């Protein structure tokens, strides 16, 4: 399918267009699955004989980590918010690496109450996140490759990195 043969494009000095050989198997390329948010379907690819890759195409749940307390809780996925490479992906709700999403705040909420003894801004954390706990939708980012591992794994926004993205969302 996709070929990565470096010959056809021009040289540094402008020499070009040899077609020394035809396209072969080791210079291969396969295709993106623009994964969405839905009932989780797992794809199968056989790569270089022994190994395999996980295309993702529909994702329901994924594992996100809360960075302040360092705990990890599996997250139900709702919607896509921001991505820097192309905003066509967000308006089609497509997951890639470094993609801003919205999540359910209630799995991180249930950890906060019975383990500590407090509610969520009706044990001190940031102000811009504590107002988002009442909204039920927390903002999170992706730090995995769904095109390779198939998982929706990532990190929730905190710190000055929170202030960078929320400036873009207004």
């Amino acid at each position: 399918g996709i070929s990565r043969d470096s010959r056809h494009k021009r040289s540094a000095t402008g020499a070009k267009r040899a077609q020394f050989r035809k396209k072969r198997k080791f210079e291969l390329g396969r295709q993106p699955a623009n994964t969405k948010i839905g009932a989780k379907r797992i794809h199968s690819v056989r790569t270089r004989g022994g190994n395999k890759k996980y295309r993702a195409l529909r994702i329901e749940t994924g594992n996100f980590s809360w960075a302040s307390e360092g705990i990890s809780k599996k997250t139900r996925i709702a919607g896509v918010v921001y991505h820097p490479s192309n905003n066509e992906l967000v308006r089609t709700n497509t997951l890639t690496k470094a993609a801003i999403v919205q999540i359910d705040a209630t799995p991180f909420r249930q950890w906060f109450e019975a383990h500590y003894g407090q509610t969520l801004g009706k044990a001190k954390i940031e102000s811009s996140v504590e107002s988002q706990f009442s909204a039920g939708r927390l903002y999170a980012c992706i730090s995995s490759r769904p095109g390779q591992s198939g998982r929706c794994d990532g990190y929730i926004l905190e710190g000055e990195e929170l202030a960078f993205y929320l400036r873009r969302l207004t």
Binding site: R30, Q31, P32, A33, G38, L57, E88
Partner: protein
Amino acid sequence: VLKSTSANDVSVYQVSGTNVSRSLPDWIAKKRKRQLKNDLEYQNRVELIQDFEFSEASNKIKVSRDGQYCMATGTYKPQIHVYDFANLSLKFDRHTDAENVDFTILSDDWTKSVHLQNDRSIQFQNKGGLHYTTRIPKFGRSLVYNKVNCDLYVGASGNELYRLNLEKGRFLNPFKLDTEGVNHVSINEVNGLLAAGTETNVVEFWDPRSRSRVSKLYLENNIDNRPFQVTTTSFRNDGLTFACGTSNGYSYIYDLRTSEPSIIKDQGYGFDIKKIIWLDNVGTENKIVTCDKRIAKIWDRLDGKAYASMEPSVDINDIEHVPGTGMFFTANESIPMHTYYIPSLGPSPRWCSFLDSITEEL
């Protein structure tokens, strides 16, 4: 065949999808394992049609006007599936570089095949393998060829509207966009007026013989929750009245008298209006299909009451219709492609000649 009531007292008949199970996708492994391990009387009751389990549903589904054909736009190892209703299997299975967002057939029975790729490009596709590939300035959502003017002109999320002629194979003097909402393209059959789906809910009527847009039509709502865009449009085969489908589920039904009033009719969910097709060919006419992401619905345009609510469990994104019949082609997000037929709409076609008999006698 299971018969399902849509609670409209109009019995809806379905096949080939979420309820039909093919226990022998591979007869070499499973059906040899079925003989000593089962009686297979339920599988003896299951009647598959045209022999495909086909993942990664499809971006679009098309049918030909002649030969009783189907196009299917697979995305697994992204591919194009062609079906013959005479032979009931794959005739032509080609794999594509990137996904075609919308497909357009040239005039009939896939003499050619025209794609609208995720890479900003059209692929020309013949009987032979992958005859020509193009490049487009912007990304693609929809495309329509017109037999008149020999032009296949495209546009999505662009500042200009891109006018390519297939005679002499060029593009020159392209049209422009008013504030870049061009999600959809639809053409009048009789008089050839262009339809457009805009973020500010405007339909742009560009006359190709005048090289210029005629008028704007705006949408207003009684509830009016959010700023909405019309995602897909349609023209009647008569060329009289207009179909407008917004993102909030509210069907807008317009008149080509250059006149603003409409009739409103919503789905219960209102997630989107996916595809709108006029039932002007089939008897008991003036009906029109309105489909959500999940809920599909056909209703009389002057009456506005539910004749059928066509609801598969897995969500879809596509409708395709065979004229004179109730043959409905939907791309449910699964391995089987749920197509389904309502006989109380109209008679079954000639390849479905026994397929009408199996359900009423049962």
